[PDB]
């Protein structure tokens, strides 16, 4: 993918918004880039609720590294569009703008696709209760005295 860094994500978001692109002769303002990167980090930390939220493979920049921009975001190839569409939606009010209906729809669709596989993975069935017998058809268990399921 040609979108390998947090700055690539931010530039894509600004282009989606039509703030700093080549279709319109505008350069990304260095004051805008840091604000957008901070918004991206805040939104990513919000999504990834310490592991119990949306898992995307994004890498959070520590305080040690000087540039928060320039580092690979670590996303998968199928998360880039979702991330930068949501980022454009989030940072549009910075400039008193409003992301258009297509951008909002793509943000919704992308976030749902982000969570789909994790939802399938977390759709797990709880074991049998501790008070449920094994039945006499489970001959080995009911011979070795495992008449009931453990549970938990």
């Amino acid at each position: 993918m040609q979108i390998k860094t947090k700055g690539d994500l931010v530039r894509a978001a600004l282009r989606k918004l039509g703030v700093a692109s080549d279709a319109t002769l505008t350069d990304v303002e260095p004051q805008s880039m840091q604000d957008a990167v901070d918004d991206l980090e805040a939104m990513m930390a919000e999504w990834y609720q310490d592991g119990k939220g949306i898992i995307t493979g994004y890498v959070f920049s520590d305080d040690e590294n000087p540039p928060a921009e320039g580092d690979d975001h670590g996303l998968r190839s199928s998360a880039v569009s979702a991330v930068f569409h949501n980022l454009a939606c989030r940072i549009a009010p910075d400039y008193a703008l409003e992301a258009t209906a297509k951008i909002i729809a793509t943000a919704k669709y992308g976030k749902e696709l982000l969570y789909k596989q994790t939802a399938i993975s977390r759709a797990k069935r709880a074991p049998y209760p501790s008070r449920m017998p094994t039945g006499s058809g489970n001959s080995f268990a009911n011979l070795n005295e495992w008449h009931y399921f453990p549970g938990e």
Partner: protein
């Protein structure tokens, strides 16, 4: 300026380029006007400066 006498923070926007005839000098985010505002727009070059059509978006 916010009072007509005292000017505030100065930002450097690239205003010209050698052999670039299409540039779009623009500053995206300006502040919030409390009561009054005015602008300075100072330039230091060795080449001709042609400026027209100053516009702002108030919302």
């Amino acid at each position: 300026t916010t009072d007509g006498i005292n000017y505030g923070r100065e930002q450097m926007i690239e205003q010209n380029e050698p052999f670039v005839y299409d540039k779009r000098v623009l500053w995206k985010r300006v502040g919030r006007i409390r009561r009054l505002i005015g602008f300075k727009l100072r330039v230091i070059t060795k080449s001709p400066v042609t400026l027209s059509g100053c516009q702002i978006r108030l919302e």
